[PDB]
Design a protein around this ligand. Structure first.
Ligand code: TPP
Ligand code: TPP
Ligand code: MG
Ligand code: MG
Lengths: 801, 801
């Protein structure tokens, strides 16, 4: 760790290129409007909330960036990708308002978006599709998301897809936010990948939200130590310009010593006291130091400010970051929380107006007016000119990509639609579907297969030879191998899945991993992905509680679909056959990257178990997309039931269909449910519509148009709720669901399917049970099936096992 | 970083205290049995899986620890807490077998546990409650979990609850696992908390599972740099004893230069070659280095080994770590993946038999026999003598704590069962409940309130001045403030929630945080918590999609309950009133820390919205615990409906009941649903049981015992599925569900509830519509109600909004 002073000594500090006075007048208007927006919202007394202190402490850091660094989207590239600290949004809206991009009506509707003309609390592309770009309010996601966005930009360049060399990724973070594991856990990656297009800006105001990050230590020293240890270029912006003379005079190096020994707690103390108290406890600690401020007046000593509030120190840091190559840069900016707010952190409103020389008269101050700069005014001219030289205004977002892709047709997946000679898995089918896409000249280079170390398990090695692994195995490799880092891989997927908007370059990512380590491990990222309008495919491999049989409790996934259904724009499927996979992937491509350009992403679970793959029934396409289609109708004179199955369990449901007809004369309609979730959502939409249109004829849920009223049984490799989801819509009086509720454990597939009570024998017993309650068969035939199938009717409920 | 050589020179190396020859014989037997176990499982051809290469590389490291360092649980403390690397479990099972703690039948049931006499693939306490202690297979969780476990041990000593000064926490990690953000994301905490009771042992065999961690880099230097930068004491065990002479006579310093410059990829290539190759490509890089081994035979050069395979080098490292204070230590052990297995890594396996001088006939190898040491033999005597000196065997685990706690009675929370004076929230109710617990002499000091920075947002301020904040606000402080670090806070919660087992010292953690950043963000930890049998409370504050109205899309939680219902042993509640919070907390406390010692943890969502808190209706306690109870019935001669509500939406449902009665003459039964999930689970357990016992009296779902058959409407602040999950069990033909499906957005609570179609207006229309379909009233009345309430029958479905 170096001394507690600026990394860039004044001797190496470049001259500041801007008009300080004018930029400050503009900055003051932004500070004012940001505050008025929050205060006006507050007046409504609707508990809307909003922050002020945060933006106040970092306004100058952002101001320097908007005036001299941030490149807006242009014809060449998407510009600088800025991960704004979420809590400073009022500051971003304030500036956008001044730039005339937001109206006063919109600002007056800060945090009131239901009626269509408001502003989101934080950066949410989903809510403001033409304004915000990156969701950052979930502490920790911004930094790791930024690292991988930066790596993805390199990837796009290395693969000759787009020249992104002029794009810089900025991640603005708080020192408290650095406590999140995701904030520092992936920094060595920036070093390995030599991400010189990534800049971390850490606002070290030493004040989290409920106290300091570390009062007994020095958070800046901790951050420097670990970032330096990680190979990053660390730039500390500790003190303002007023300290430089003192540092030069300091010949005994006693001042440096004083600053080094002084701890955070001490520094936060002086912050509240006065100039006398400072030159007493601080400067008044050594004859050499106390002598430094002898000619200084208590007024001049109290003027000493921190580097994060000095445009000149800030510019030097960003400039150096911009020039650095070979490694990522982190700027530790020392600021004051609640800067210039005195009171907090009309008397208070008057204080800041005077503190920042805001152009608002006493006559208008009561009205909390917004300040504007008329066209022709010096401020208006400078504001727009600085931005014009930087290609425009940011943030901004284009909701749709412009080019038109020539997507492969379903026919191109022809081989997958016919019976398979060999027994394969849906995972192998997925890989084969990828190969089809890899043969489409229009999208072949747009595909981004992503893996987290394990590739052999997913039979992806076959692609390694075809398209290679991205490894700046060379920089032309198409596959992203992120190793044991699902969060990093997910961030790579997100960068690729939103490339269509960010760089107007549609990339189609396919992230394959252990389904268990998907939404469960990176769910916060999947939620952010929906907010970011990601369009891609998440492939949950080795899914199903009973299918990844030998791995046990922390690997067997019987609930990822329950987690995925919580995401509004995530479309989920659990296909049993190779042709369903083909149809679903095709529909997904067409919907997301076809003319429709729907803002959804696909979650498809695939299996590691091989079995016979039949041919797709004629006309089953639409049913497969909708989520359900009748596979076949097995005849039977002693009764009729409906059997629904999905994923690896469908095969067993069909076995049960045979047993029911062969041994009990019970016929049935067997349906393959490719997506219980899509069916449930369709049902919900129908009932909602019916409720709001009482004078109209009721709409019928699709599942209800496909099924009849005969007793039904459903079984899947996921917890029961996955299939119980559609209960309200099933037009039968009886609907029994089997599922894999409970912790997984190690064993053979057969033992697990029996243990979780989802195999053929249980489907049969469940079906006979429903028929028995209808009087179609004697309850005793049910009790005998139980004995016959060696079913332990008294074993503990698997959910409790 | 330092030179690519051992941190501890021979001169400073303590004499090895054990019998090297004897230990070698014992270790060879363990290596052998570990391999026999996995191979025997392979023979069954049931896709059980299992690894061998990993343990082979770290076997000697664990051997030195088992022989000279690992202290087993004893009368004074829980002994050393070892986070074993997940996939090396066959080696731990093999040692347990040799120690006589496991039988051959168990080894033969490796990864076949459904029938009760098998072994889990990985460390899963839930599955082997008396053997394993810490789930580590989910890469990344072990490191951070271990850090917070060590911090918790010091917490227990500082608080004067237990002297843990003789306990050391060991975390064995692989170098590839260090890529998970969680692995290094929290290592600076070990320095902040001066965790000299923590030792990280990183097995640096230089490769993941699909290849090297960093082929073109040096992972060991990368780790040294970041851990040292983090303030940790780093000890590198690079080379075996045979290198000492070479390094001693190398007066040119060239050998060191050679070691420093060679990258991981090259080192890995040497292993797959031979002596001549190494003499040429390694030592042959320089005249000086070539001369050092010039008089050496190719066989002697090939004998040079990595430090992690030399007991003397390993011993020295662990001994040094034991004497280091004021900071944590990380040992970087250089090893060979697939050590002694030949080739890459029936009869071909006779290679390992020869390599490790395994005492097994070259004729019996076909049977894959396990080796054992008969009592009275040098090996047996030594094996046990070393462990006895270290208090016994590990791992081992006590499923229940021994002491008896005198928990508070429901009456002690009496104040919370009465009508509250002013309007408060369920979060304020939660805090008041905590204060009641803090007056209980038996558990007051065992309580561990945990907060993720934000504490004043949850009204925790009052508790600070009362019990203080842990800050070794002093060492006696009781509250754990972990800052913006949900995962860290969750790991502290986990350490506390499992203290009853590891230290036989029950502690009762209450971790309150923003519900949106609960399961969605630390879901994998919550799953591991279930596996680890955690007993504590997770309090999801500021919950409900429409209740945290200003925050928007990434804060408005309308689905944490959907995610929590996926964890088998997590009991979830969403109470609307203060008395419900009191009843739930009391019950949870009694179930987990009372005589029952139920292995479950609680998840309770609380609100930030104040409203009238009525008195608990007499006799509602059990219904509150079960998930539902009837609040009241309202008379009406024109019709009758059932209205269900939970959390903050319940009061709006009651508003609807009044409207229906006064404006339309429609009466109703109003129910408060404290837990739709427990009701759903109960329902599922009932029908599961009924399905399996077709001849017996069917069990009736609890919800069916509370509700009748009149058309029903349910509304909650969560997505429809939260309430729809009980459809199957609801005894009414009509069950309409209103929910907050779709991404949240900022606005007033009033506007969000209308937008999400969950306010009183929608409940009324839903109810009137159900009656219109039954011909109870003219459809026009429903049409007119829609108009009167300003309902936009055609606005887009909120899920798509
Ligand atoms: C994952 C997550 N945890 C917690 C929060 C709540 N939160 C928002 S800001 C904040 C503290 C702000 O401190 P810092 O990150 O240092 O930034 P500052 O506002 O001081 O610049 C917290 C805990 C959140 N939004 N997301
Ligand atoms: C979160 C998570 N992702 C992936 C895996 C799959 N996995 C099991 S072992 C392994 C590689 C382990 O490599 P390393 O940590 O270097 O240890 P080694 O076996 O070489 O000692 C992986 C990726 C897992 N268990 N958990
Ligand atoms: Mg801060
Ligand atoms: Mg390794």
């Amino acid at each position: 760790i170096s001394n507690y002073i600026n990394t860039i000594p004044v001797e190496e500090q470049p001259e500041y290129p801007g008009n300080l006075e004018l930029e400050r007048r503009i900055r003051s208007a932004i500070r004012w409007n940001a505050i008025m927006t929050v205060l006006r919202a507050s007046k409504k007394d609707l508990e809307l909330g909003g922050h002020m202190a945060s933006f106040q402490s970092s306004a100058t850091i952002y101001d320097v960036c908007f005036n001299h660094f941030f490149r807006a989207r242009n014809e060449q590239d998407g510009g600088d990708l800025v991960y704004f600290q979420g809590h400073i949004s009022p500051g971003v809206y304030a500036r956008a308002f001044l730039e005339g991009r937001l109206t006063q009506e919109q600002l007056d509707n800060f945090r009131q978006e239901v009626h269509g003309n408001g502003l989101s609390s934080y950066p949410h592309p989903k809510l403001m599709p033409e304004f915000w770009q990156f969701p950052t309010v979930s502490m920790g996601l911004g930094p790791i998301g930024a690292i991988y966005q930066a790596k993805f930009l390199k990837y796009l360049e290395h693969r000759g897809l787009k020249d992104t060399s002029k794009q810089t990724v900025y991640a603005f973070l708080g020192d408290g936010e650095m406590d999140a594991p995701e904030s520092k856990g992936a920094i060595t990656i920036a070093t390995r990948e030599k991400l010189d297009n990534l800049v971390f800006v850490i606002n070290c105001n030493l004040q989290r939200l409920d106290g300091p990050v570390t009062g007994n230590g020095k958070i800046i020293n901790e951050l420097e130590g670990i970032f330096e240890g990680a190979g990053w270029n660390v730039i500390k912006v500790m003190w303002g310009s007023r300290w430089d003379e003192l540092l030069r005079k300091d010949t005994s190096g006693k001042l440096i010593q004083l600053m080094n020994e002084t701890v955070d707690g001490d520094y936060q103390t002086f912050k509240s006291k006065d100039g006398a108290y400072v030159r007493e406890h601080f400067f008044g600690k050594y004859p050499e130091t106390a002598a430094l401020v002898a000619d200084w007046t208590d007024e001049q000593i109290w003027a000493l400010n921190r580097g994060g509030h000095d445009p000149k120190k800030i510019y030097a840091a960003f400039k150096k970051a911009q020039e650095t190559k070979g490694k990522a840069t982190v700027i530790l900016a020392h600021t004051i929380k609640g800067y210039g707010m005195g009171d907090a952190a009309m008397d208070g409103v008057r204080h800041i107006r005077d503190r920042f020389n805001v152009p608002v008269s006493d006559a208008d101050i009561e009205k909390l007016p917004y300040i504007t700069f008329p066209e022709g005014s010096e401020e208006h001219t400078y504001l727009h000119a600085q931005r014009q030289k930087l290609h425009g205004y940011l943030p901004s977002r284009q909701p749709n990509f412009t080019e038109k892709l020539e997507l492969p047709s379903l026919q191109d997946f022809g081989a997958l639609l016919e019976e398979q000679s060999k027994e394969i898995s849906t995972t192998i089918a997925f890989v084969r579907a990828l190969n089809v896409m890899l043969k489409n000249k229009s999208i072949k280079d747009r595909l981004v297969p992503i893996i987290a170390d394990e590739a052999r398990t997913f039979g992806m090695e076959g692609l390694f030879r075809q398209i290679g692994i991205y490894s700046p195995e060379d920089e032309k490799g198409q596959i992203l191998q992120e190793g044991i880092n699902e969060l990093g891989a997910g961030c790579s997927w997100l960068a690729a899945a939103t490339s269509y908007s960010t760089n107007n370059l549609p990339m189609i990512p396919f992230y394959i991993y252990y389904s268990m380590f998907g939404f469960q491990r990176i769910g916060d990222l999947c939620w952010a992905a929906g907010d970011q309008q990601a369009r891609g495919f998440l492939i949950g491999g080795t899914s199903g509680r009973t299918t990844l049989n030998g791995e046990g409790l922390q690997h067997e996934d019987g609930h990822s679909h329950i987690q995925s259904l919580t995401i509004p724009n995530c479309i989920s499927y659990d296909p049993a056959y190779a042709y369903e996979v083909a149809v679903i992937m095709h529909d997904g491509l067409e919907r997301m990257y076809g003319e429709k350009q729907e803002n959804v992403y696909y979650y498809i679970t695939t299996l590691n178990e091989n079995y016979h793959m039949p041919a797709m029934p004629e006309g089953a396409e639409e049913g497969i997309r909708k989520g359900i289609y009748k596979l076949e109708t097995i005849e039977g004179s002693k009764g009729k039931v409906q059997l629904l199955g999905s994923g690896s369990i469908l095969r067993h449901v069909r076995e049960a269909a045979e047993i029911l007809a062969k041994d009990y004369g019970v016929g049935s309609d067997v349906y393959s449910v490719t997506s219980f979730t899509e069916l449930a959502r369709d049902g919900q939409d129908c009932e909602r519509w019916n409720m709001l249109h009482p004078l109209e004829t009721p709409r019928v849920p699709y599942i209800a148009q496909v099924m009849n009223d005969a007793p039904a049984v459903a079984s899947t490799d996921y917890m029961k709720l996955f299939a119980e989801q559609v209960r309200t819509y099933v037009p039968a009086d009886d609907y029994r669901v089997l599922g894999t509720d409970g912790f997984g454990r190690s064993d053979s597939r057969e033992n697990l399917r029996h243990h979780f009570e989802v195999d053929a024998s249980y489907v049969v017993v469940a079906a006979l049970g429903e028929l028995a309650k209808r009087g179609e068969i004697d309850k005793k035939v049910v009790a005998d099936a139980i004995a016959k199938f060696n079913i332990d009717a008294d074993k503990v409920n698997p959910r409790l096992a």
